[PDB]
């Protein structure tokens, strides 16, 4: 569902909707299948978010995703890919 709208949503409603849920995603960014699935979705929505254009907290978020890949069952590989 989401990526369909996100790839084609108006670049103004995009800003409003995301700015509504910036911290709502930052906090949740940090059995276990639920966690990895939610983070799947979070990566797959934040990438499309960033695809548009560039507050000041955003600087941190970069690292918060980088380590997410650098860790070294297939859901783990999908997580690294996302």
């Amino acid at each position: 569902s989401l990526l369909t709208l996100l790839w084609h949503c108006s670049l103004d409603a995009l800003r409003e909707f995301f700015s509504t849920i910036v911290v709502d995603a930052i906090d949740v960014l940090k059995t276990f299948d639920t966690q990895i699935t939610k983070k799947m979705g979070y990566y797959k929505i934040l990438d499309v978010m960033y695809s548009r254009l560039p507050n000041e907290l955003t600087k941190t978020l970069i690292k918060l995703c980088y380590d997410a890949f650098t860790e070294n069952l297939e859901r783990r590989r999908l997580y690294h890919c996302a």
Binding site: P54, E56, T58, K59, K63
Partner: protein, 80 residues
């Protein structure tokens, strides 16, 4: 004389590459008296002038801080 001249060169470059708070600045402002060669004049005086002012300043170079995995973080803090 010349032995302590090359010794002066060595100690000056050694303190230069050393980084201190109360660094050679105190030494230099008191090193206004013969911090450089004096055995044959001409070269002695010009070398003294060159060494008195330690010669320029310009910063460059990426990922050169402590703990490079924070150097990218230092690079990370450049967008706001």
């Amino acid at each position: 004389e010349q032995r302590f001249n090359n010794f002066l060169k060595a100690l000056q470059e050694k303190v230069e590459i050393k980084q201190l708070n109360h660094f050679w600045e105190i030494v230099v402002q008191d090193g206004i008296t013969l911090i450089t060669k004096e055995e044959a004049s001409g070269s002695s005086v010009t070398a003294e002038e060159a060494k008195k002012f330690l010669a320029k300043d310009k910063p460059s170079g990426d990922t050169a801080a402590v703990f490079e995995e924070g150097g990218d973080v230092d690079d990370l803090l450049d967008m706001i």
